[PDB]
């Protein structure tokens, strides 16, 4: 599995991994602990496959939004920074790395869309979306436009749509409410309507996508575009005299771009959790640490206050951090896929006049709520089944007779650690080759029974445990009414035998 006594770190090949490697060598110099940095191809796909077997890196670096899913699968450890350390990062970044209310990664860098403008077409950019029409009209006579950006992808149009009160999923008390979706409220309707009216009034074109906006800006045809730090390179080569600044407000409210937080999580299967904490808190998240990474490849804006204040000597970075501080942290739940698809259709439909704004957003709202509802139900069922499993596993593994049937090696170093896991089945969508699930049926009195089966394994036996639980009517928590264990070569053992 994961080598104890050393650190293996996974980070994407587009980050400053050589800078990170140098931080590791300083860690090694000081502590004697070796740090190995790798940047495997498709690491965000590999990590869940590998960490589910107990393998993988000790530390994984990736955008925060994938981590919620990782945490659901039980792949990430809860981290434990003290308040003193948390105080060293911008408060808003900690809201990006929570699951079930708990902290599950360290924020490293921060990324958001900004307004990018051409200084030779627009020496002072507008601070307000409401300013853009009059501005475009004056620019049009000069044969140029005010603004072109990607309208095909809701990531780019969201900042305006969310400004007056739209939101993806509501975040409250350190968690998301996936059934609370803010796509069809007055605020989202107002923002999209404004966008639609920019198009109706010929100030923008519905067809405009990423490459069209990029080439339009970098050839001086339009005064402004909306884009992120990844685009700055191509602008430099274009030799446009450009500036990067705060996104325009709408109805007095800041635009709310989605914020992405590069984060470092700790593999729940790692035996080096304390070493990882030391490395991340005391070596990487320092001015010296981030600077080493940043010199290899720019991190952009960072979560660490002391170093971000150094970096803002590049005004483009100060603009990124400003938009991120006013933006919407991208929710770290898997259901964002439903959000992306539904809102993409809504915006395309509204922008091209295929549907009214109100109809478009209402359909989007309904599609997301349907997806959230099914997910929430599956989530509640799995959580309930997991509870049955946990109670059942404790009863089996503590039973002296069953341990004897299992021929447990309960010798001089104590009780054998038994393993429990679900039956192996054909894997499809959401895989899980071994889900812990129960089948359900109603009895004559309308009460649901749950039927579950799972394995308990010692070195000498793999046993099958069968249970039947009957839901109360009630004082919470279902009662087990039948539970037995079939150990190969042995007579069935009844923990509870239904009469």
Swiss-Prot record:
It comes from Escherichia coli (strain K12). This is Maltose/maltodextrin-binding periplasmic protein. Its main location: periplasm. The keyword Transport applies. CDD domains: PBP2_MBP (cd13656). The gene is malE. The complex is composed of two ATP-binding proteins (MalK), two transmembrane proteins (MalG and MalF) and a solute-binding protein (MalE). Part of the ABC transporter complex MalEFGK involved in maltose/maltodextrin import. Binds maltose and higher maltodextrins such as maltotriose. Belongs to the bacterial solute-binding protein 1 family. The lineage of its organism: Bacteria, Pseudomonadati, Pseudomonadota, Gammaproteobacteria, Enterobacterales.
């Amino acid at each position: 599995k994961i080598e104890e006594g050393k650190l293996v770190i996974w980070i994407n090949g587009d980050k400053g991994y050589n800078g990170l490697a140098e931080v590791g060598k300083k860690f090694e110099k000081d502590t004697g602990i070796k740090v190995t940095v790798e940047h495997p191809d498709k690491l965000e796909e590999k990590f869940p496959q590998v960490a589910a077997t107990g393998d993988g890196p000790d530390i994984i670096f990736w955008a925060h939004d994938r981590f919620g899913g990782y945490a659901q699968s039980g792949l990430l450890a809860e981290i434990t920074p003290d308040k003193a350390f948390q105080d060293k990062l911008y408060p808003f970044t900690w809201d990006a790395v929570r699951y079930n209310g708990k902290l599950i990664a360290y924020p490293i860098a921060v990324e958001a869309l900004s307004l990018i403008y051409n200084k030779d077409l627009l020496p002072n950019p507008p601070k307000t979306w409401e300013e853009i029409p009059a501005l475009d009209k004056e620019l049009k006579a000069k044969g140029k436009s005010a603004l072109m950006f990607n309208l095909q992808e809701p990531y780019f149009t969201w900042p305006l749509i969310a400004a007056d009160g739209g939101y993806a999923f509501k975040y409250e008390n350190g968690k998301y409410d996936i059934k609370d979706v803010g796509v069809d409220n007055a605020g989202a309707k107002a923002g999209l309507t404004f966008l639609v009216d920019l198009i109706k009034n010929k100030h923008m074109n519905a067809d405009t996508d990423y490459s069209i906006a990029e080439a339009a800006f970098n050839k001086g045809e339009t005064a402004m575009t909306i884009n992120g730090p990844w685009a700055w390179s191509n602008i430099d080569t274009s030799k446009v005299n450009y500036g990067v600044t705060v996104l325009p407000t709408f109805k007095g409210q800041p635009s709310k771009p989605f914020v992405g937080v590069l984060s470092a999580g700790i593999n729940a299967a790692s035996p080096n959790k304390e070493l990882a904490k030391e490395f991340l808190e005391n070596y990487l998240l320092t001015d010296e640490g981030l600077e080493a990474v940043n010199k290899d490849k720019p991190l952009g804006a960072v979560a660490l206050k002391s170093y971000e204040e150094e970096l803002v000597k590049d005004p483009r970075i100060a603009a990124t951090m400003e938009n991120a501080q006013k933006g919407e942290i991208m929710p770290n739940i898997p259901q964002m896929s439903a959000f992306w698809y539904a809102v993409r259709t809504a915006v395309i439909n509204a922008a091209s006049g295929r549907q009214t704004v109100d109809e478009a957003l209402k359909d989007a709202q309904t599609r997301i709520e349907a997806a959230a509802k099914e997910a929430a139900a599956k989530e509640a069922a799995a959580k309930a089944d997991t509870q049955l499993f946990n109670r059942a596993v404790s009863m089996v593994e503590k039973n002296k007779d069953i341990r004897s049937l299992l021929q447990c090696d309960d010798g001089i170093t104590g009780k054998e650690r038994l393993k429990a896991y679900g039956e192996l089945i054909t894997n499809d969508k959401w895989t899980r080759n071994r889900p812990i699930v129960s089948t359900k049926k109603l009895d004559k009195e309308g009460r649901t029974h749950h039927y579950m089966r799972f394995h308990v394994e010692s070195k000498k036996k793999i046993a099958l445990v069968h249970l039947e639980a009957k839901e109360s009517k009630q004082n919470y928590q279902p009662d087990f009414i039948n539970m037995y264990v079939d150990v190969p070569g042995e007579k069935r053992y009844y923990l509870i035998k239904l009469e």
